């Protein structure tokens with residue numbers, strides 16, 4: 001019934017959620033549905049959201065098991081063709097939703113754009129098998145996925161409390177979900193555990209890898225590490241998966 005659905009997970013977001021809603025409602029050229037999924041905010045968050053009361057806004061307010069649990073609740077209730085996810089501290093740039101609708105009007109299931117973090121562009125990678133040995137290739141809040149994309153790929157894995165977004169995009173890549181990357185800015189806004197989750201996601205792609213080998217690949221793709229052992233890993237596991245070989249050949253063409 002809508003062109004776009006925007007899911008906004010919130011908890012104690014009274015300080016910015018108004019700006020976020022303002023950045024969405026001022027988008028021209030599209031019919032939009034907004035689903036706010038609140039984890040039971042004790043502050044004014046709900047009172048600010050109701051100030052934007054409209055027929056195309058839905059408020060859920062109940063306890064949940066985290067950001068991706070609230071995201072799953074909102075995606076499940078989405079009624080628009082393309083679904084995006086926006087945090088209360090983020091904002092969409094002008095005309096971004098019309099761009100999404102036009103690019104998706106060709107049947108592409110994912111439309112992703114650039115992300116502005118502290119006045120710098122996110123160091124994006126390509127949406128391709130080479131990302132399966134890295135992280136999420138583009139900002140998650142800059143991504144719009146169709147109803148079909150979610151229906152085929154599924155919901156976010158709550159086992160990953162940090163990198164559930166990267167894991168979902170990696171499942172979309174593996175499912176051959178079509179993706180179009182627009183070179184325009186769409187959104188502006190325990191590290192060892194981040195590394196552990198990233199390596200576990202990579203292992204879910206290639207279950208034959210040890211954790212240290214996945215970490216080596218990750219750092220190699222992200223320019224954080226060395227690449228002298230890549231040929232050793234390829235010869236060792238190349239027989240296991242053609243997709244593993246393709247990911248290594250795209251990431252390290254010198255090999």
Ligand SMILES: C[C@@H]1O[C@H](OP(=O)(O)OP(=O)(O)OC[C@H]2O[C@@H](n3cnc4c(=O)[nH]c(N)nc43)[C@H](O)[C@@H]2O)[C@@H](F)[C@H](O)[C@@H]1O
Nearest residue numbers: 009010011013037038039064066067070087088140141165
């Ligand atoms: C939006 C996400 O953000 C992630 O990283 P990020 O660093 O931005 O986390 P952040 O906490 O700053 O924002 C989280 C947003 O959900 C709200 N929030 C926080 N905790 C809870 C909770 O328990 N329950 C419910 N219902 N909402 C909660 C918070 O108010 C804010 O609106 C990205 F990795 C990810 O791809 C995604 O884009």
